[PDB]
């Protein structure tokens, strides 16, 4: 059971207003045929245009919410809305475009999907709240057939050109006019009571209904993300590497060790309360401090209430020493904290739009993160950049320009001249740090944190 059987039943109740008289008894096989597509008993990697919820979750980066609204059905113009915010008007003769024939509309569809998806995925998954017109409009911009490769590279083909009779992936499709072998899923098949807006609004107040097709497209994809990543969480699913994943993850581990090690040296806390991942390991294994772990899985819905994490009777006194919240999203951090909190607003190929202001961060695994809130950090301040090292000044074994920096906290800089080793290590650390910040991570610390207190660890 890898793909969705074409013989699976499709509930058509949601289609009977746009398609009156539709048979109650319906399979994907018959629905695809009714949409104007012929599959010809083809065993060539494309068994069904529709996919399972599990295959959709594996291809979340490909999700594009799609809705079609009747402007006035062969005689009337159609408003095509995408979760990218685009609205196109197709005539049969929040970006709003005036009515144009299908031959040009399809060129715009390929460009939009190629630019949105080339750095995210090898395919498109149209996320629907199917009522009829979206399904019957697909024959105007979609071509299907055997799985193919791009004419300019080894990636699978996602587009087709009637001008050249060739195929292309999202990276090589300039001037292409047809979406080739797209995938789709109808959220309405999952068993919901009531319309799209009533189900979406139960979990999200960020997406409104400005009564246009792209608003419905956005709501559909949001609802789909809520069902698959908020109320249902699967951390076993692995996602391909598409950017700086390994460098970001390595940088996170380097920054964590650096910051915690310096906080322990500067303020000598007798105890550290590590709150978060149940599989966490001591990030500063040589530190003197009493290390105490508290298990909390990543919150994917709302941020944890500090009252529930701490109270209800552990040192019991979290007020003693320091609290470490490394990607443990809480509503209001205590004043004695070291915090790393992912900023959901960050634009990147790893961070996809989420539910209720939250975002879906996809780096090896998928993590829906509650909306970033500046008020969570009222008892803390922003952690400034610094590099600290007590390692011996010794080159061992990359050309050089002398480093001068007030934030290179080393014996050699204390002594008036940064050595080659600490300058190389400083520049590597500054690069790792910048990578982590640009990925969306933000660092916060207790207000008494002062790097001036690190210089006296060189005596
Ligand atoms: C030396 N000094 C005043 C401090 C040491 C550690 N934390 C804060 C202040
Ligand atoms: Zn290509
Ligand atoms: Zn929403
Ligand atoms: Zn040095």
From Swiss-Prot:
<feature type="domain" description="N7-MTase">
    <location>
        <begin position="239"/>
        <end position="459"/>
    </location>
</feature>
<feature type="domain" description="ExoN">
    <location>
        <begin position="49"/>
        <end position="230"/>
    </location>
</feature>
<feature type="binding site">
    <location>
        <position position="412"/>
    </location>
    <ligand>
        <name>Zn(2+) 16</name>
    </ligand>
</feature>
<comment type="subunit">
    <text>Interacts (via N-terminus) with DDX1. Interacts with nsp10.</text>
</comment>
<feature type="active site">
    <location>
        <position position="69"/>
    </location>
</feature>
<feature type="binding site">
    <location>
        <position position="150"/>
    </location>
    <ligand>
        <name>Zn(2+) 14</name>
    </ligand>
</feature>
<comment type="function">
    <text>Plays a role in viral RNA synthesis through two distinct activities. The N7-guanine methyltransferase activity plays a role in the formation of the cap structure GpppA-RNA. The proofreading exoribonuclease reduces the sensitivity of the virus to RNA mutagens during replication. This activity acts on both ssRNA and dsRNA in a 3'-5' direction.</text>
</comment>
<feature type="binding site">
    <location>
        <position position="69"/>
    </location>
    <ligand>
        <name>Mg(2+) 2</name>
    </ligand>
</feature>
<feature type="binding site">
    <location>
        <position position="419"/>
    </location>
    <ligand>
        <name>Zn(2+) 16</name>
    </ligand>
</feature>
<feature type="binding site">
    <location>
        <position position="222"/>
    </location>
    <ligand>
        <name>Zn(2+) 15</name>
    </ligand>
</feature>
<feature type="binding site">
    <location>
        <position position="169"/>
    </location>
    <ligand>
        <name>Zn(2+) 14</name>
    </ligand>
</feature>
<feature type="binding site">
    <location>
        <position position="422"/>
    </location>
    <ligand>
        <name>Zn(2+) 16</name>
    </ligand>
</feature>
<feature type="binding site">
    <location>
        <position position="204"/>
    </location>
    <ligand>
        <name>Zn(2+) 15</name>
    </ligand>
</feature>
<feature type="active site">
    <location>
        <position position="134"/>
    </location>
</feature>
<feature type="binding site">
    <location>
        <position position="172"/>
    </location>
    <ligand>
        <name>Zn(2+) 14</name>
    </ligand>
</feature>
<feature type="binding site">
    <location>
        <position position="216"/>
    </location>
    <ligand>
        <name>Mg(2+) 2</name>
    </ligand>
</feature>
<feature type="binding site">
    <location>
        <position position="67"/>
    </location>
    <ligand>
        <name>Mg(2+) 1</name>
    </ligand>
</feature>
<feature type="binding site">
    <location>
        <position position="393"/>
    </location>
    <ligand>
        <name>Zn(2+) 16</name>
    </ligand>
</feature>
<feature type="binding site">
    <location>
        <begin position="274"/>
        <end position="280"/>
    </location>
    <ligand>
        <name>S-adenosyl-L-methionine</name>
    </ligand>
</feature>
<feature type="region of interest" description="GpppA-binding">
    <location>
        <begin position="355"/>
        <end position="369"/>
    </location>
</feature>
<protein>
    <recommendedName>
        <fullName>Guanine-N7 methyltransferase nsp14</fullName>
    </recommendedName>
</protein>
<feature type="binding site">
    <location>
        <position position="153"/>
    </location>
    <ligand>
        <name>Zn(2+) 14</name>
    </ligand>
</feature>
<feature type="binding site">
    <location>
        <position position="200"/>
    </location>
    <ligand>
        <name>Zn(2+) 15</name>
    </ligand>
</feature>
<feature type="binding site">
    <location>
        <position position="134"/>
    </location>
    <ligand>
        <name>Mg(2+) 1</name>
    </ligand>
</feature>
<feature type="active site">
    <location>
        <position position="216"/>
    </location>
</feature>
<feature type="active site">
    <location>
        <position position="211"/>
    </location>
</feature>
<feature type="binding site">
    <location>
        <position position="211"/>
    </location>
    <ligand>
        <name>Mg(2+) 2</name>
    </ligand>
</feature>
<feature type="binding site">
    <location>
        <position position="207"/>
    </location>
    <ligand>
        <name>Zn(2+) 15</name>
    </ligand>
</feature>
<feature type="active site">
    <location>
        <position position="67"/>
    </location>
</feature>
């Amino acid at each position: 059971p890898t793909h969705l059987s074409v013989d699976t039943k499709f509930k058509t109740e949601g289609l009977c207003v746009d398609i009156p008289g539709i048979p109650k008894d319906m399979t994907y096989r018959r629905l695809i045929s009714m949409m104007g597509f012929k599959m010809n008993y083809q065993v060539n990697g494309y068994p069904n245009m529709f996919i399972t919820r599990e295959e959709a979750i594996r291809h979340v980066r490909a999700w594009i919410g799609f809705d079609v609204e009747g402007c006035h059905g062969t005689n009337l113009p159609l408003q095509l809305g995408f979760s990218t915010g685009v609205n196109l008007v197709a005539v049969p003769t929040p970006l709003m475009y005036k009515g144009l024939p299908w031959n040009v509309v399809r060129i715009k569809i390929v460009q939009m999907l190629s630019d949105t998806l080339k750095n995210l995925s090898d395919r498109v998954v149209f996320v629907l709240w199917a009522h009829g017109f979206e399904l019957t409009s697909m024959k105007y911009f979609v071509k299907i057939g055997p799985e193919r490769t791009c004419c300019l590279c080894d990636r699978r083909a996602t587009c087709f050109s009637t001008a050249s009779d060739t195929y292309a992936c999202w990276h090589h499709s300039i001037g292409f006019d047809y979406v080739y072998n797209p995938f789709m899923i109808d959220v309405q098949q999952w068993g919901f009571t009531g319309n799209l807006q009533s189900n979406h609004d139960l979990y999200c107040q960020v997406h409104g209904n400005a009564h246009v097709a792209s608003c419905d497209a956005i709501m559909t994809r949001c609802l789909a993300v809520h069902e698959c990543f908020v109320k249902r969480v699967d951390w076993t699913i692995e996602y391909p590497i598409i950017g700086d994943e390994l460098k970001i993850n390595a940088a996170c581990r380097k920054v964590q060790h650096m910051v915690v090690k310096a906080a322990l040296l500067a303020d000598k806390f007798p105890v550290l309360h590590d709150i978060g991942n149940p599989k966490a390991i001591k990030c500063v294994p040589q530190a003197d401090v009493e290390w105490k772990f508290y298990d909390a899985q990543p919150c994917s819905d709302k941020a944890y209430k500090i009252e529930e994490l701490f109270y209800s009777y552990h040192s019991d006194k979290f007020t003693d020493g320091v609290c470490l919240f490394w990607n443990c999203n809480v509503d209001r951090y205590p004043a004695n904290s070291i915090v790393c909190r992912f900023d959901t607003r960050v634009l990147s190929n790893l961070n996809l739009p989420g539910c209720d202001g939250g975002s879906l961060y996809v780096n090896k695994h998928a993590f829906h993160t509650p909306a970033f809130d500046k008020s969570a950090f009222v008892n803390l301040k922003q952690l400034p950049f610094f590099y600290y090292s007590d390692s011996p000044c010794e080159s061992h074994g990359i050309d050089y320009v002398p480093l001068k920096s007030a934030t290179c906290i080393t014996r050699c800089n204390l002594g008036g001249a940064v050595c080659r080793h600490h300058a190389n290590e400083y520049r590597l650390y500054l690069d790792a740090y910048n990578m982590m910040i640009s990925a969306g991570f933000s660092l916060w610390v207790y207000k008494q944190f002062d790097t001036y207190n690190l210089w006296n660890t060189f005596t």
